[PDB]
Amino acid sequence: CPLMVKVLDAVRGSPAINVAVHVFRKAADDTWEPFASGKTSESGELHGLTTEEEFVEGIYKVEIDTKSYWKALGISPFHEHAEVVFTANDRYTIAALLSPYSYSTTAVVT
Amino acid sequence: CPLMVKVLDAVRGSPAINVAVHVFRKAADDTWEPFASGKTSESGELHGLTTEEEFVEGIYKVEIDTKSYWKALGISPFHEHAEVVFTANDSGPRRYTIAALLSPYSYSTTAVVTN
Ligand SMILES: O=C(O)c1ccc2nc(-c3c(Cl)cccc3Cl)oc2c1
Ligand SMILES: O=C(O)c1ccc2nc(-c3c(Cl)cccc3Cl)oc2c1
């Protein structure tokens, strides 16, 4: 698994479960083309997004639907979503920690 | 100002100076239209982006050019940039501070919304 996403909830101290995550790759035309997507699991993780073969060098965007997550909890959040944009240059874990008016993200590249 | 941006550097323990920031607003046809831009000052702050009049309801994207910042400092960071996307002024005018704290492989952002 060359790409994994983990999402945590900083308010409740728990995995952020059932959060939609969409991954895009930049095409030769400056636009974002769909690449991979899923919903985080009970442990706040999303695996099986891609294969080593498909995950070539490029610029990728990981979009995390944080607004839906908070709304489902009865909480009006600030951000429309959380976006993480990076170049993959030949394992990537994109981690995100969420609060209604804040988020933090880190990359663990091993 | 109704929109302010503050950027700190978690590596040096300092304001992040001369960070380019571009703000876009979502148009009716769903394109990101340029709205404003600037660079952070020696205190890591960017003021004067817009006016109460021009900062109407909408979905805004504040893009902080973190890669250009780390690259101007001679190192190669992880992210291309840090984006902050939010609906603004949908229950009347508010004042927004978008704060960001930067490291080469990580960033954090928070919003302070008043009045
Ligand atoms: O339990 C896990 O599997 C887990 C793995 C990685 C991780 N990173 C992290 C984090 C972020 Cl993303 C931003 C700011 C501060 C912290 Cl501590 O929390 C967290 C939890
Ligand atoms: O000195 C200032 O003017 C200053 C103002 C606001 C602010 N927020 C912040 C922050 C972020 Cl943005 C993310 C995670 C943790 C923290 Cl403490 O640092 C910081 C510094």
PDB file of C-alpha atoms and ligand atoms in Angstrom:
ATOM      1  CA  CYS A   1       0.000   0.000   0.000  1.00  0.00           C
ATOM      2  CA  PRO A   2       1.822   3.087  -1.286  1.00  0.00           C
ATOM      3  CA  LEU A   3      -0.927   5.470  -0.016  1.00  0.00           C
ATOM      4  CA  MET A   4      -2.935   5.425   3.227  1.00  0.00           C
ATOM      5  CA  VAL A   5      -5.061   8.101   4.894  1.00  0.00           C
ATOM      6  CA  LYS A   6      -5.787   8.346   8.626  1.00  0.00           C
ATOM      7  CA  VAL A   7      -8.267  10.797  10.146  1.00  0.00           C
ATOM      8  CA  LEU A   8      -8.665  11.592  13.811  1.00  0.00           C
ATOM      9  CA  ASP A   9     -11.204  13.618  15.753  1.00  0.00           C
ATOM     10  CA  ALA A  10      -9.560  16.036  18.188  1.00  0.00           C
ATOM     11  CA  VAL A  11     -12.788  16.922  19.942  1.00  0.00           C
ATOM     12  CA  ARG A  12     -13.902  13.443  20.933  1.00  0.00           C
ATOM     13  CA  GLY A  13     -10.500  11.738  20.995  1.00  0.00           C
ATOM     14  CA  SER A  14     -11.472   9.089  18.485  1.00  0.00           C
ATOM     15  CA  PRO A  15     -10.885   7.917  14.900  1.00  0.00           C
ATOM     16  CA  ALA A  16     -13.001   9.942  12.497  1.00  0.00           C
ATOM     17  CA  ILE A  17     -15.143   7.186  10.986  1.00  0.00           C
ATOM     18  CA  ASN A  18     -17.077   7.140   7.678  1.00  0.00           C
ATOM     19  CA  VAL A  19     -15.341  10.296   6.391  1.00  0.00           C
ATOM     20  CA  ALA A  20     -15.332  10.512   2.571  1.00  0.00           C
ATOM     21  CA  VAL A  21     -11.912  10.935   1.043  1.00  0.00           C
ATOM     22  CA  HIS A  22     -11.282  11.684  -2.619  1.00  0.00           C
ATOM     23  CA  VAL A  23      -7.875  11.489  -4.226  1.00  0.00           C
ATOM     24  CA  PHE A  24      -7.023  13.268  -7.476  1.00  0.00           C
ATOM     25  CA  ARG A  25      -3.992  13.437  -9.757  1.00  0.00           C
ATOM     26  CA  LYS A  26      -2.944  16.510 -11.739  1.00  0.00           C
ATOM     27  CA  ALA A  27      -3.270  15.902 -15.480  1.00  0.00           C
ATOM     28  CA  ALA A  28      -1.056  17.378 -18.233  1.00  0.00           C
ATOM     29  CA  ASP A  29      -3.714  20.114 -18.557  1.00  0.00           C
ATOM     30  CA  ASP A  30      -3.598  21.647 -15.017  1.00  0.00           C
ATOM     31  CA  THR A  31      -6.917  20.010 -14.008  1.00  0.00           C
ATOM     32  CA  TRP A  32      -7.710  17.457 -11.302  1.00  0.00           C
ATOM     33  CA  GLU A  33      -8.683  13.997 -12.474  1.00  0.00           C
ATOM     34  CA  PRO A  34     -10.256  11.450 -10.120  1.00  0.00           C
ATOM     35  CA  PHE A  35      -7.783   8.822  -8.933  1.00  0.00           C
ATOM     36  CA  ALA A  36      -9.148   7.034  -5.855  1.00  0.00           C
ATOM     37  CA  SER A  37     -11.734   7.376  -3.115  1.00  0.00           C
ATOM     38  CA  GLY A  38     -13.273   5.710  -0.097  1.00  0.00           C
ATOM     39  CA  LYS A  39     -14.712   6.226   3.373  1.00  0.00           C
ATOM     40  CA  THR A  40     -12.520   5.900   6.488  1.00  0.00           C
ATOM     41  CA  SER A  41     -13.005   2.690   8.503  1.00  0.00           C
ATOM     42  CA  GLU A  42     -13.886   2.211  12.185  1.00  0.00           C
ATOM     43  CA  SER A  43     -10.222   2.932  12.956  1.00  0.00           C
ATOM     44  CA  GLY A  44     -10.291   6.144  10.881  1.00  0.00           C
ATOM     45  CA  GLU A  45      -8.111   4.605   8.184  1.00  0.00           C
ATOM     46  CA  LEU A  46      -8.426   4.224   4.455  1.00  0.00           C
ATOM     47  CA  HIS A  47      -6.267   1.636   2.744  1.00  0.00           C
ATOM     48  CA  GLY A  48      -6.420   0.026  -0.696  1.00  0.00           C
ATOM     49  CA  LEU A  49      -6.595   3.351  -2.477  1.00  0.00           C
ATOM     50  CA  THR A  50      -4.006   2.450  -5.099  1.00  0.00           C
ATOM     51  CA  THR A  51      -1.292   0.030  -6.217  1.00  0.00           C
ATOM     52  CA  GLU A  52       2.455   0.682  -6.608  1.00  0.00           C
ATOM     53  CA  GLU A  53       1.979   0.316 -10.343  1.00  0.00           C
ATOM     54  CA  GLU A  54      -0.705   3.052 -10.554  1.00  0.00           C
ATOM     55  CA  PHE A  55       0.871   5.423  -8.023  1.00  0.00           C
ATOM     56  CA  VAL A  56       3.429   7.043 -10.343  1.00  0.00           C
ATOM     57  CA  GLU A  57       5.263  10.341  -9.730  1.00  0.00           C
ATOM     58  CA  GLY A  58       2.963  13.325  -9.969  1.00  0.00           C
ATOM     59  CA  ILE A  59       1.040  15.922  -8.007  1.00  0.00           C
ATOM     60  CA  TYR A  60      -1.819  14.503  -5.946  1.00  0.00           C
ATOM     61  CA  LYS A  61      -4.665  16.052  -4.006  1.00  0.00           C
ATOM     62  CA  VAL A  62      -6.281  14.290  -1.053  1.00  0.00           C
ATOM     63  CA  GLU A  63      -9.650  15.850  -0.256  1.00  0.00           C
ATOM     64  CA  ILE A  64     -11.226  14.988   3.102  1.00  0.00           C
ATOM     65  CA  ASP A  65     -14.959  15.773   3.491  1.00  0.00           C
ATOM     66  CA  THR A  66     -14.697  17.283   6.961  1.00  0.00           C
ATOM     67  CA  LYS A  67     -17.862  19.371   6.610  1.00  0.00           C
ATOM     68  CA  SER A  68     -20.131  16.292   6.337  1.00  0.00           C
ATOM     69  CA  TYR A  69     -18.370  14.697   9.271  1.00  0.00           C
ATOM     70  CA  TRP A  70     -19.068  17.627  11.631  1.00  0.00           C
ATOM     71  CA  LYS A  71     -22.571  18.250  10.327  1.00  0.00           C
ATOM     72  CA  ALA A  72     -23.499  14.638  11.146  1.00  0.00           C
ATOM     73  CA  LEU A  73     -22.464  15.361  14.746  1.00  0.00           C
ATOM     74  CA  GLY A  74     -24.720  18.447  14.980  1.00  0.00           C
ATOM     75  CA  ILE A  75     -21.696  20.733  14.768  1.00  0.00           C
ATOM     76  CA  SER A  76     -21.437  23.663  12.304  1.00  0.00           C
ATOM     77  CA  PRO A  77     -17.808  23.608  11.114  1.00  0.00           C
ATOM     78  CA  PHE A  78     -15.625  26.222   9.479  1.00  0.00           C
ATOM     79  CA  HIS A  79     -13.999  24.483   6.497  1.00  0.00           C
ATOM     80  CA  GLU A  80     -15.738  23.191   3.384  1.00  0.00           C
ATOM     81  CA  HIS A  81     -13.237  20.322   3.358  1.00  0.00           C
ATOM     82  CA  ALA A  82      -9.573  19.673   4.119  1.00  0.00           C
ATOM     83  CA  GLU A  83      -7.261  19.432   1.126  1.00  0.00           C
ATOM     84  CA  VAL A  84      -3.750  18.000   1.129  1.00  0.00           C
ATOM     85  CA  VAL A  85      -1.696  18.607  -2.021  1.00  0.00           C
ATOM     86  CA  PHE A  86       1.739  17.126  -2.581  1.00  0.00           C
ATOM     87  CA  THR A  87       4.145  15.691  -5.136  1.00  0.00           C
ATOM     88  CA  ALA A  88       4.827  11.961  -4.958  1.00  0.00           C
ATOM     89  CA  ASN A  89       8.489  11.537  -5.981  1.00  0.00           C
ATOM     90  CA  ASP A  90       9.559   7.873  -5.937  1.00  0.00           C
ATOM     91  CA  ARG A  91       4.869   4.375   1.578  1.00  0.00           C
ATOM     92  CA  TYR A  92       2.908   7.611   2.094  1.00  0.00           C
ATOM     93  CA  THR A  93       0.642   8.072   5.081  1.00  0.00           C
ATOM     94  CA  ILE A  94      -1.391  11.270   5.044  1.00  0.00           C
ATOM     95  CA  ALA A  95      -2.666  11.875   8.559  1.00  0.00           C
ATOM     96  CA  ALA A  96      -5.189  14.547   9.523  1.00  0.00           C
ATOM     97  CA  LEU A  97      -6.430  15.709  12.913  1.00  0.00           C
ATOM     98  CA  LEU A  98      -9.760  17.510  12.867  1.00  0.00           C
ATOM     99  CA  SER A  99     -11.594  20.108  14.934  1.00  0.00           C
ATOM    100  CA  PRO A 100     -14.578  22.245  13.919  1.00  0.00           C
ATOM    101  CA  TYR A 101     -12.441  25.361  13.239  1.00  0.00           C
ATOM    102  CA  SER A 102      -9.033  23.787  12.762  1.00  0.00           C
ATOM    103  CA  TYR A 103      -7.120  20.960  11.202  1.00  0.00           C
ATOM    104  CA  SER A 104      -3.599  19.686  11.143  1.00  0.00           C
ATOM    105  CA  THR A 105      -2.019  17.328   8.648  1.00  0.00           C
ATOM    106  CA  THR A 106       1.263  15.513   8.478  1.00  0.00           C
ATOM    107  CA  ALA A 107       2.946  13.153   5.994  1.00  0.00           C
ATOM    108  CA  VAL A 108       4.748  10.034   7.211  1.00  0.00           C
ATOM    109  CA  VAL A 109       6.899   8.802   4.331  1.00  0.00           C
ATOM    110  CA  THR A 110       8.611   5.453   5.096  1.00  0.00           C
TER     111      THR A 110
ATOM    112  CA  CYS B   1      -9.690  44.169   8.314  1.00  0.00           C
ATOM    113  CA  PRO B   2     -12.425  41.599   7.599  1.00  0.00           C
ATOM    114  CA  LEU B   3      -9.796  39.087   6.379  1.00  0.00           C
ATOM    115  CA  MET B   4      -6.341  38.599   7.880  1.00  0.00           C
ATOM    116  CA  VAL B   5      -3.786  35.812   7.488  1.00  0.00           C
ATOM    117  CA  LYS B   6      -1.081  34.932  10.071  1.00  0.00           C
ATOM    118  CA  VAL B   7       1.661  32.398   9.368  1.00  0.00           C
ATOM    119  CA  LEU B   8       4.224  30.971  11.803  1.00  0.00           C
ATOM    120  CA  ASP B   9       7.323  28.785  11.242  1.00  0.00           C
ATOM    121  CA  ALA B  10       7.524  25.816  13.592  1.00  0.00           C
ATOM    122  CA  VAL B  11      11.146  25.064  12.623  1.00  0.00           C
ATOM    123  CA  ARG B  12      12.630  28.467  13.426  1.00  0.00           C
ATOM    124  CA  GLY B  13      10.167  29.672  16.055  1.00  0.00           C
ATOM    125  CA  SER B  14       9.396  32.821  14.146  1.00  0.00           C
ATOM    126  CA  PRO B  15       6.779  34.474  12.002  1.00  0.00           C
ATOM    127  CA  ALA B  16       6.895  33.071   8.471  1.00  0.00           C
ATOM    128  CA  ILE B  17       7.952  36.172   6.528  1.00  0.00           C
ATOM    129  CA  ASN B  18       7.305  36.890   2.827  1.00  0.00           C
ATOM    130  CA  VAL B  19       4.910  33.960   2.378  1.00  0.00           C
ATOM    131  CA  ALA B  20       2.817  34.450  -0.774  1.00  0.00           C
ATOM    132  CA  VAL B  21      -0.928  34.105  -0.213  1.00  0.00           C
ATOM    133  CA  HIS B  22      -3.588  33.972  -2.929  1.00  0.00           C
ATOM    134  CA  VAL B  23      -7.312  34.213  -2.156  1.00  0.00           C
ATOM    135  CA  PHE B  24      -9.993  32.994  -4.558  1.00  0.00           C
ATOM    136  CA  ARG B  25     -13.777  33.193  -4.495  1.00  0.00           C
ATOM    137  CA  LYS B  26     -16.070  30.595  -6.041  1.00  0.00           C
ATOM    138  CA  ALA B  27     -18.023  32.055  -8.986  1.00  0.00           C
ATOM    139  CA  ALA B  28     -21.631  31.289 -10.023  1.00  0.00           C
ATOM    140  CA  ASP B  29     -20.269  28.974 -12.749  1.00  0.00           C
ATOM    141  CA  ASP B  30     -18.182  27.169 -10.074  1.00  0.00           C
ATOM    142  CA  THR B  31     -14.736  28.442 -11.117  1.00  0.00           C
ATOM    143  CA  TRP B  32     -12.198  29.794  -8.589  1.00  0.00           C
ATOM    144  CA  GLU B  33     -11.975  33.491  -9.416  1.00  0.00           C
ATOM    145  CA  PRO B  34      -8.968  35.464  -8.157  1.00  0.00           C
ATOM    146  CA  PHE B  35     -10.055  37.642  -5.238  1.00  0.00           C
ATOM    147  CA  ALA B  36      -6.917  38.991  -3.587  1.00  0.00           C
ATOM    148  CA  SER B  37      -3.270  38.238  -2.903  1.00  0.00           C
ATOM    149  CA  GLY B  38      -0.322  39.451  -0.871  1.00  0.00           C
ATOM    150  CA  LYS B  39       2.728  38.448   1.096  1.00  0.00           C
ATOM    151  CA  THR B  40       3.208  38.153   4.874  1.00  0.00           C
ATOM    152  CA  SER B  41       5.085  40.934   6.615  1.00  0.00           C
ATOM    153  CA  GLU B  42       8.043  40.656   8.999  1.00  0.00           C
ATOM    154  CA  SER B  43       5.493  39.796  11.700  1.00  0.00           C
ATOM    155  CA  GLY B  44       4.072  36.943   9.528  1.00  0.00           C
ATOM    156  CA  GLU B  45       0.835  38.900   9.016  1.00  0.00           C
ATOM    157  CA  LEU B  46      -1.043  39.832   5.889  1.00  0.00           C
ATOM    158  CA  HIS B  47      -3.620  42.619   6.131  1.00  0.00           C
ATOM    159  CA  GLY B  48      -5.374  44.764   3.541  1.00  0.00           C
ATOM    160  CA  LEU B  49      -6.553  41.924   1.335  1.00  0.00           C
ATOM    161  CA  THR B  50     -10.105  43.207   1.021  1.00  0.00           C
ATOM    162  CA  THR B  51     -12.784  45.575   2.289  1.00  0.00           C
ATOM    163  CA  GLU B  52     -16.054  44.983   4.116  1.00  0.00           C
ATOM    164  CA  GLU B  53     -17.838  46.035   0.911  1.00  0.00           C
ATOM    165  CA  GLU B  54     -15.990  43.675  -1.430  1.00  0.00           C
ATOM    166  CA  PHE B  55     -15.911  40.707   0.954  1.00  0.00           C
ATOM    167  CA  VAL B  56     -19.447  39.547   0.272  1.00  0.00           C
ATOM    168  CA  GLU B  57     -21.011  36.124   0.991  1.00  0.00           C
ATOM    169  CA  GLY B  58     -19.299  33.294  -0.815  1.00  0.00           C
ATOM    170  CA  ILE B  59     -16.989  30.294  -0.664  1.00  0.00           C
ATOM    171  CA  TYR B  60     -13.392  31.473  -0.331  1.00  0.00           C
ATOM    172  CA  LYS B  61     -10.087  29.665  -0.789  1.00  0.00           C
ATOM    173  CA  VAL B  62      -6.999  31.002   0.956  1.00  0.00           C
ATOM    174  CA  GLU B  63      -3.976  29.381  -0.614  1.00  0.00           C
ATOM    175  CA  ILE B  64      -0.708  29.722   1.285  1.00  0.00           C
ATOM    176  CA  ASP B  65       2.342  29.116  -0.858  1.00  0.00           C
ATOM    177  CA  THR B  66       4.236  26.956   1.598  1.00  0.00           C
ATOM    178  CA  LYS B  67       6.392  25.217  -1.037  1.00  0.00           C
ATOM    179  CA  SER B  68       7.632  28.551  -2.405  1.00  0.00           C
ATOM    180  CA  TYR B  69       8.377  29.562   1.216  1.00  0.00           C
ATOM    181  CA  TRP B  70      10.438  26.473   2.106  1.00  0.00           C
ATOM    182  CA  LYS B  71      12.066  26.551  -1.389  1.00  0.00           C
ATOM    183  CA  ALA B  72      13.025  30.234  -1.005  1.00  0.00           C
ATOM    184  CA  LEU B  73      14.750  29.037   2.174  1.00  0.00           C
ATOM    185  CA  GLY B  74      16.625  26.423   0.168  1.00  0.00           C
ATOM    186  CA  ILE B  75      14.902  23.201   1.233  1.00  0.00           C
ATOM    187  CA  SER B  76      12.429  20.795  -0.394  1.00  0.00           C
ATOM    188  CA  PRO B  77       9.119  20.437   1.507  1.00  0.00           C
ATOM    189  CA  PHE B  78       6.250  17.884   1.228  1.00  0.00           C
ATOM    190  CA  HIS B  79       3.163  19.950   0.377  1.00  0.00           C
ATOM    191  CA  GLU B  80       2.641  22.097  -2.722  1.00  0.00           C
ATOM    192  CA  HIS B  81       0.714  24.604  -0.614  1.00  0.00           C
ATOM    193  CA  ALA B  82      -1.707  24.831   2.275  1.00  0.00           C
ATOM    194  CA  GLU B  83      -5.317  25.639   1.297  1.00  0.00           C
ATOM    195  CA  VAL B  84      -8.074  26.811   3.573  1.00  0.00           C
ATOM    196  CA  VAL B  85     -11.601  26.743   2.037  1.00  0.00           C
ATOM    197  CA  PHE B  86     -14.598  28.173   3.831  1.00  0.00           C
ATOM    198  CA  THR B  87     -17.970  29.830   3.453  1.00  0.00           C
ATOM    199  CA  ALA B  88     -17.799  33.425   4.624  1.00  0.00           C
ATOM    200  CA  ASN B  89     -20.407  36.002   5.681  1.00  0.00           C
ATOM    201  CA  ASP B  90     -23.380  33.693   5.259  1.00  0.00           C
ATOM    202  CA  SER B  91     -25.044  35.077   8.423  1.00  0.00           C
ATOM    203  CA  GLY B  92     -23.880  38.661   7.876  1.00  0.00           C
ATOM    204  CA  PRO B  93     -20.380  40.216   8.047  1.00  0.00           C
ATOM    205  CA  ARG B  94     -17.712  38.616  10.207  1.00  0.00           C
ATOM    206  CA  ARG B  95     -14.009  39.251  10.735  1.00  0.00           C
ATOM    207  CA  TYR B  96     -11.803  36.259   9.820  1.00  0.00           C
ATOM    208  CA  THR B  97      -8.267  35.453  10.890  1.00  0.00           C
ATOM    209  CA  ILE B  98      -6.764  32.441   9.135  1.00  0.00           C
ATOM    210  CA  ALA B  99      -3.698  31.267  11.072  1.00  0.00           C
ATOM    211  CA  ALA B 100      -1.246  28.626   9.871  1.00  0.00           C
ATOM    212  CA  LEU B 101       1.712  26.934  11.486  1.00  0.00           C
ATOM    213  CA  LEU B 102       4.237  25.425   9.061  1.00  0.00           C
ATOM    214  CA  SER B 103       6.811  22.632   9.086  1.00  0.00           C
ATOM    215  CA  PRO B 104       8.326  20.991   6.056  1.00  0.00           C
ATOM    216  CA  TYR B 105       6.092  17.828   6.261  1.00  0.00           C
ATOM    217  CA  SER B 106       3.173  19.182   8.268  1.00  0.00           C
ATOM    218  CA  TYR B 107       0.959  22.193   8.709  1.00  0.00           C
ATOM    219  CA  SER B 108      -1.868  23.236  10.976  1.00  0.00           C
ATOM    220  CA  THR B 109      -4.496  25.881  10.426  1.00  0.00           C
ATOM    221  CA  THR B 110      -7.144  27.483  12.549  1.00  0.00           C
ATOM    222  CA  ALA B 111      -9.751  30.163  12.045  1.00  0.00           C
ATOM    223  CA  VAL B 112     -10.733  32.838  14.472  1.00  0.00           C
ATOM    224  CA  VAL B 113     -14.081  34.357  13.578  1.00  0.00           C
ATOM    225  CA  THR B 114     -15.420  37.399  15.376  1.00  0.00           C
ATOM    226  CA  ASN B 115     -18.552  39.619  15.555  1.00  0.00           C
TER     227      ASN B 115
HETATM  228  O1  LIG C   1      -3.447   6.812  16.513  1.00  0.00           O
HETATM  229  C1  LIG C   1      -2.950   6.931  15.381  1.00  0.00           C
HETATM  230  O2  LIG C   1      -2.908   5.972  14.569  1.00  0.00           O
HETATM  231  C2  LIG C   1      -2.362   8.237  14.940  1.00  0.00           C
HETATM  232  C3  LIG C   1      -1.401   8.199  13.952  1.00  0.00           C
HETATM  233  C4  LIG C   1      -0.808   9.401  13.494  1.00  0.00           C
HETATM  234  C5  LIG C   1      -1.208  10.608  14.060  1.00  0.00           C
HETATM  235  N1  LIG C   1      -0.860  11.895  13.852  1.00  0.00           N
HETATM  236  C6  LIG C   1      -1.581  12.694  14.697  1.00  0.00           C
HETATM  237  C7  LIG C   1      -1.487  14.157  14.765  1.00  0.00           C
HETATM  238  C8  LIG C   1      -1.825  14.961  13.695  1.00  0.00           C
HETATM  239 CL1  LIG C   1      -2.404  14.228  12.181  1.00  0.00          CL
HETATM  240  C9  LIG C   1      -1.747  16.340  13.771  1.00  0.00           C
HETATM  241  C10 LIG C   1      -1.317  16.941  14.952  1.00  0.00           C
HETATM  242  C11 LIG C   1      -0.974  16.130  16.028  1.00  0.00           C
HETATM  243  C12 LIG C   1      -1.064  14.756  15.930  1.00  0.00           C
HETATM  244 CL2  LIG C   1      -0.616  13.811  17.355  1.00  0.00          CL
HETATM  245  O3  LIG C   1      -2.424  11.950  15.477  1.00  0.00           O
HETATM  246  C13 LIG C   1      -2.182  10.630  15.056  1.00  0.00           C
HETATM  247  C14 LIG C   1      -2.763   9.448  15.516  1.00  0.00           C
HETATM  248  O1  LIG C   2       1.662  34.517  17.820  1.00  0.00           O
HETATM  249  C1  LIG C   2       0.651  34.599  17.107  1.00  0.00           C
HETATM  250  O2  LIG C   2       0.264  35.690  16.607  1.00  0.00           O
HETATM  251  C2  LIG C   2      -0.134  33.367  16.849  1.00  0.00           C
HETATM  252  C3  LIG C   2      -1.426  33.610  16.608  1.00  0.00           C
HETATM  253  C4  LIG C   2      -2.260  32.432  16.345  1.00  0.00           C
HETATM  254  C5  LIG C   2      -1.723  31.118  16.366  1.00  0.00           C
HETATM  255  N1  LIG C   2      -2.166  29.836  16.174  1.00  0.00           N
HETATM  256  C6  LIG C   2      -1.139  28.835  16.311  1.00  0.00           C
HETATM  257  C7  LIG C   2      -1.341  27.481  16.169  1.00  0.00           C
HETATM  258  C8  LIG C   2      -1.711  26.983  14.951  1.00  0.00           C
HETATM  259 CL1  LIG C   2      -2.041  28.108  13.589  1.00  0.00          CL
HETATM  260  C9  LIG C   2      -1.843  25.616  14.829  1.00  0.00           C
HETATM  261  C10 LIG C   2      -1.581  24.785  15.918  1.00  0.00           C
HETATM  262  C11 LIG C   2      -1.187  25.338  17.135  1.00  0.00           C
HETATM  263  C12 LIG C   2      -1.071  26.693  17.246  1.00  0.00           C
HETATM  264 CL2  LIG C   2      -0.569  27.395  18.801  1.00  0.00          CL
HETATM  265  O3  LIG C   2      -0.006  29.595  16.608  1.00  0.00           O
HETATM  266  C13 LIG C   2      -0.379  30.962  16.627  1.00  0.00           C
HETATM  267  C14 LIG C   2       0.427  32.074  16.879  1.00  0.00           C
END
